[PDB]
Design an enzyme around this catalytic site. Sequence first.
Site, PDB file in Angstrom:
ATOM      1  N   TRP A   1      24.079   2.328  29.710  1.00 28.95           N
ATOM      2  CA  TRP A   1      23.673   1.020  29.751  1.00 28.95           C
ATOM      3  C   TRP A   1      23.009   0.550  28.642  1.00 28.95           C
ATOM      4  O   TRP A   1      22.530   1.462  27.646  1.00 28.95           O
ATOM      5  CB  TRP A   1      22.557   1.119  31.003  1.00 28.95           C
ATOM      6  CG  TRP A   1      21.501   2.068  30.628  1.00 28.95           C
ATOM      7  CD1 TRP A   1      21.192   3.319  31.134  1.00 28.95           C
ATOM      8  CD2 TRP A   1      20.222   1.530  30.110  1.00 28.95           C
ATOM      9  NE1 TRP A   1      19.933   3.885  30.568  1.00 28.95           N
ATOM     10  CE2 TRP A   1      19.206   2.716  29.956  1.00 28.95           C
ATOM     11  CE3 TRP A   1      19.643   0.330  29.533  1.00 28.95           C
ATOM     12  CZ2 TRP A   1      18.161   2.552  29.549  1.00 28.95           C
ATOM     13  CZ3 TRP A   1      18.519   0.346  28.874  1.00 28.95           C
ATOM     14  CH2 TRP A   1      17.694   1.386  28.924  1.00 28.95           C
TER      15      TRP A   1
ATOM     16  N   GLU B   1       6.851   3.632  23.199  1.00 31.41           N
ATOM     17  CA  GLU B   1       8.431   3.887  23.064  1.00 31.41           C
ATOM     18  C   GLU B   1       9.091   3.151  21.827  1.00 31.41           C
ATOM     19  O   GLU B   1       9.651   3.753  21.066  1.00 31.41           O
ATOM     20  CB  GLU B   1       9.301   2.926  24.311  1.00 31.41           C
ATOM     21  CG  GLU B   1       9.157   3.713  25.548  1.00 31.41           C
ATOM     22  CD  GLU B   1      10.123   4.810  25.717  1.00 31.41           C
ATOM     23  OE1 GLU B   1      10.964   4.947  24.680  1.00 31.41           O
ATOM     24  OE2 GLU B   1      10.433   5.465  26.689  1.00 31.41           O
TER      25      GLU B   1
ATOM     26  N   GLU C   1      16.958   6.557  23.000  1.00 31.75           N
ATOM     27  CA  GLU C   1      15.378   6.086  23.129  1.00 31.75           C
ATOM     28  C   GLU C   1      15.383   4.685  22.714  1.00 31.75           C
ATOM     29  O   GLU C   1      14.503   3.987  23.384  1.00 31.75           O
ATOM     30  CB  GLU C   1      14.558   7.083  22.356  1.00 31.75           C
ATOM     31  CG  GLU C   1      14.657   8.381  22.918  1.00 31.75           C
ATOM     32  CD  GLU C   1      13.727   8.561  24.364  1.00 31.75           C
ATOM     33  OE1 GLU C   1      13.188   7.770  24.704  1.00 31.75           O
ATOM     34  OE2 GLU C   1      13.699   9.850  24.718  1.00 31.75           O
TER      35      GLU C   1
ATOM     36  N   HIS D   1      15.326   1.867  25.221  1.00 37.39           N
ATOM     37  CA  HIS D   1      14.101   1.823  26.308  1.00 37.39           C
ATOM     38  C   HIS D   1      12.901   0.916  25.834  1.00 37.39           C
ATOM     39  O   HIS D   1      12.551  -0.174  26.437  1.00 37.39           O
ATOM     40  CB  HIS D   1      13.269   3.209  26.270  1.00 37.39           C
ATOM     41  CG  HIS D   1      14.159   4.361  26.625  1.00 37.39           C
ATOM     42  ND1 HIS D   1      13.680   5.501  27.031  1.00 37.39           N
ATOM     43  CD2 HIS D   1      15.335   4.198  27.042  1.00 37.39           C
ATOM     44  CE1 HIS D   1      14.691   6.295  27.234  1.00 37.39           C
ATOM     45  NE2 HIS D   1      15.703   5.649  27.424  1.00 37.39           N
TER      46      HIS D   1
ATOM     47  N   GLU E   1       8.810  14.932  27.366  1.00 36.65           N
ATOM     48  CA  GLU E   1       9.904  14.217  27.939  1.00 36.65           C
ATOM     49  C   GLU E   1       9.366  14.157  29.300  1.00 36.65           C
ATOM     50  O   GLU E   1       9.487  13.027  30.168  1.00 36.65           O
ATOM     51  CB  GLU E   1      11.226  14.718  27.957  1.00 36.65           C
ATOM     52  CG  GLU E   1      11.856  14.481  26.414  1.00 36.65           C
ATOM     53  CD  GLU E   1      12.319  13.196  26.216  1.00 36.65           C
ATOM     54  OE1 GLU E   1      12.294  12.261  27.076  1.00 36.65           O
ATOM     55  OE2 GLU E   1      12.764  12.784  25.049  1.00 36.65           O
TER      56      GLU E   1
ATOM     57  N   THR F   1       6.839  11.307  30.020  1.00 32.88           N
ATOM     58  CA  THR F   1       7.473  10.084  30.079  1.00 32.88           C
ATOM     59  C   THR F   1       8.342   9.804  31.410  1.00 32.88           C
ATOM     60  O   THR F   1       8.096   8.864  31.953  1.00 32.88           O
ATOM     61  CB  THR F   1       8.416   9.573  28.920  1.00 32.88           C
ATOM     62  OG1 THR F   1       9.282  10.743  28.705  1.00 32.88           O
ATOM     63  CG2 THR F   1       7.567   9.814  27.540  1.00 32.88           C
TER      64      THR F   1
ATOM     65  N   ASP G   1      17.073   8.484  32.041  1.00 38.11           N
ATOM     66  CA  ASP G   1      17.167   9.108  30.610  1.00 38.11           C
ATOM     67  C   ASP G   1      16.304  10.009  30.231  1.00 38.11           C
ATOM     68  O   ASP G   1      16.638  11.130  29.742  1.00 38.11           O
ATOM     69  CB  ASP G   1      17.217   7.848  29.704  1.00 38.11           C
ATOM     70  CG  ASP G   1      18.383   6.926  29.899  1.00 38.11           C
ATOM     71  OD1 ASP G   1      19.219   6.846  30.502  1.00 38.11           O
ATOM     72  OD2 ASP G   1      18.418   5.958  28.880  1.00 38.11           O
ATOM     73  N   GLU G   2      14.986  10.041  30.317  1.00 36.36           N
ATOM     74  CA  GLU G   2      14.095  10.907  30.186  1.00 36.36           C
ATOM     75  C   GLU G   2      14.508  12.034  30.901  1.00 36.36           C
ATOM     76  O   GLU G   2      14.146  13.431  30.083  1.00 36.36           O
ATOM     77  CB  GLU G   2      12.514  10.410  30.435  1.00 36.36           C
ATOM     78  CG  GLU G   2      12.357   8.964  30.263  1.00 36.36           C
ATOM     79  CD  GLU G   2      12.520   8.545  28.726  1.00 36.36           C
ATOM     80  OE1 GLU G   2      13.044   9.261  27.855  1.00 36.36           O
ATOM     81  OE2 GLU G   2      11.666   7.703  28.068  1.00 36.36           O
TER      82      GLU G   2
ATOM     83  N   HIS H   1      16.865  14.128  29.000  1.00 36.50           N
ATOM     84  CA  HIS H   1      15.972  14.782  27.736  1.00 36.50           C
ATOM     85  C   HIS H   1      15.289  15.933  27.966  1.00 36.50           C
ATOM     86  O   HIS H   1      15.500  17.070  27.337  1.00 36.50           O
ATOM     87  CB  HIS H   1      15.247  13.675  27.129  1.00 36.50           C
ATOM     88  CG  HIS H   1      16.223  12.472  26.758  1.00 36.50           C
ATOM     89  ND1 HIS H   1      15.583  11.183  26.605  1.00 36.50           N
ATOM     90  CD2 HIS H   1      17.520  12.422  26.400  1.00 36.50           C
ATOM     91  CE1 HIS H   1      16.445  10.294  26.102  1.00 36.50           C
ATOM     92  NE2 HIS H   1      17.630  10.896  26.124  1.00 36.50           N
TER      93      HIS H   1
HETATM   94 FE   LIG Z   1      12.560  10.813  26.294  1.00 39.66          FE
HETATM   95 FE   LIG Z   2      11.707   7.388  25.988  1.00 43.79          FE
END
Ligand SMILES: [Fe+2]
Ligand SMILES: [Fe+2]
Lengths: 323, 329
Positions: free
Chosen positions: B28, B71, B109, B112, B162, B165, B194-195, B198
Amino acid sequence: PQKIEIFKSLDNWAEENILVHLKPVEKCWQPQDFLPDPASDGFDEQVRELRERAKEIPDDYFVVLVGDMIKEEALPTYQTMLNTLDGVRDETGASPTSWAIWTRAWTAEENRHGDLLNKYLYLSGRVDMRQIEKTIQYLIGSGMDPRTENSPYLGFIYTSFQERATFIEHGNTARQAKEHGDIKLAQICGTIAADEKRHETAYTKIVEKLFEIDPDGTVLAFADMMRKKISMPAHLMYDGRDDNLFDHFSAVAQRLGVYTAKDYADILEFLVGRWKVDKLTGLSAEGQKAQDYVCRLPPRIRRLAKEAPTMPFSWIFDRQVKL
Amino acid sequence: QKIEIFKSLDNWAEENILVHLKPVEKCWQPQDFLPDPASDGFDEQVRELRERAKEIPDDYFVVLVGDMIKEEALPTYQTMLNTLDGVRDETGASPTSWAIWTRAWTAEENRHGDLLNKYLYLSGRVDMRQIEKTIQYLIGSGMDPRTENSPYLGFIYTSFQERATFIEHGNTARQAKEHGDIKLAQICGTIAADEKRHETAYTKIVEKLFEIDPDGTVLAFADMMRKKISMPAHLMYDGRDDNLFDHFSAVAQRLGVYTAKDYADILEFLVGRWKVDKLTGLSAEGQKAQDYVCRLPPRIRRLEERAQGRAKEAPTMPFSWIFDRQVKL
Ligand SMILES: [Fe+2]
Ligand SMILES: [Fe+2]
Ligand SMILES: [Fe+2]
Ligand SMILES: [Fe+2]
């Protein structure tokens, strides 16, 4: 380790001669200064006016502006690059050395350039921010190798060249924005250009001291860097579609006169002058050979026509512009 | 020693770690969740956004902004990664697995901050000038997580960060629904997702480290908790409030976006996920470290129950991020 320990002694010198070229944060402009104010009643009218003026700016100018913006948004890469260099590497991530303070503050300054340009382009409605955003993600993941080899000598010569290049680019996009009727856009590119000038000044100042202390080491470095060629920080540009995106982008920038191969040589001629490599004396046999190569290079590049084809750019929804 | 361990795991990383990145074509982009400036509905989409934003209270915005600032400080976190001994990008485009990760992670990242930034911009509910200035301080300021160039400490740290967040962005997504904005909820949720990837990757590295070198890795884990996990935005400053981080963390505490409970719940999760719990055949030191780590989460929870009991009024406080308007602490 002798070129490395040189930089720990210059720590205090840097505080007085280099760090002075950062603008204190309270005195720094912020993207919001040059953008429609979303907290004011005039927001909608400011945005309508921006988009209206943006229609009169041609696609080819946008392709170049976008490319420059992308280059800016790839910032994490350039901080990393700085921290590869042997005498200036931030050991902890908040190291209180002059070189580390600069690195972080320089980064903090450059960060506003991308932010401002990004929103401008977003609001303009004249570009595909999806493809621009994707290009950026490739670019960051891609990294960039300037072949500075962990050497601060090579590194700061490189940054010196790069800063002046962005100074010229942003400078010219400012000029042409006036020419297309948008003084607010012209202001954006001009203010950004002015920052780059301070950065150029600081980076050229470091190399000047390096030419003072160790002239042999620093011409050889300067020769090495031109022998390799100055690799541009966005050479690995990719949008998932065009394998020659950088060259196609560079070509539009060449035609429009934002950045030309002339400007490349003009930069090198400036740096030869600014560092007085020209009048350096008492070098090793190698040092003298390096001195020659460097000084004769600018005319030799300058020595080395017509209807070009149109090319689609995903940054403008595959609409076409001349190359 | 602990450094050469990582050059062997290069190939292992390609297969077990790099698989948790989303390929760029499948990723995305902020533009997916924002008013489309190339469509005719732009002006309506923006008007709708701003209209929904009025119904979201200031205190939520203070927390969202703080998370967004965290971020946008991204250059710092890439640098942090490149301080670590086995994973440092030597050239700036090194083709090692660890370097490819570092860059790709950073590239992920980056979206974000971009997305949140434009959201907040368009909302008209916050002072982007002061936010922008806070960010400039934060980047200039740096951050020291005291990972000491150790990938063992480093990846434990990132694993913790991670998941934090993930919880933060997760909760801001929940509360955006509660305040009537699903498009904002979507933004926070997509970021949160996404986090999670990670987190999964970073926990996976530490798992292998606990396999190979269990003594070294519990000691590392103890070291890191003894120091305390220093938050990446602790040096937050807007040129006005000297206690900006604490005041921001306090609103996030009250709203339940991130609480000291969540701190302990993270640690309890990581103890479980790495099976520090059932580690055997350690040195006398290793066993002492094992104990400390496992007894820590209930401790923290006790000390917080006591802190909530004796709470000192909690005044309203102005925040320059919202034009000095005031919110409870
Ligand atoms: Fe992250
Ligand atoms: Fe992040
Ligand atoms: Fe720049
Ligand atoms: Fe610059």
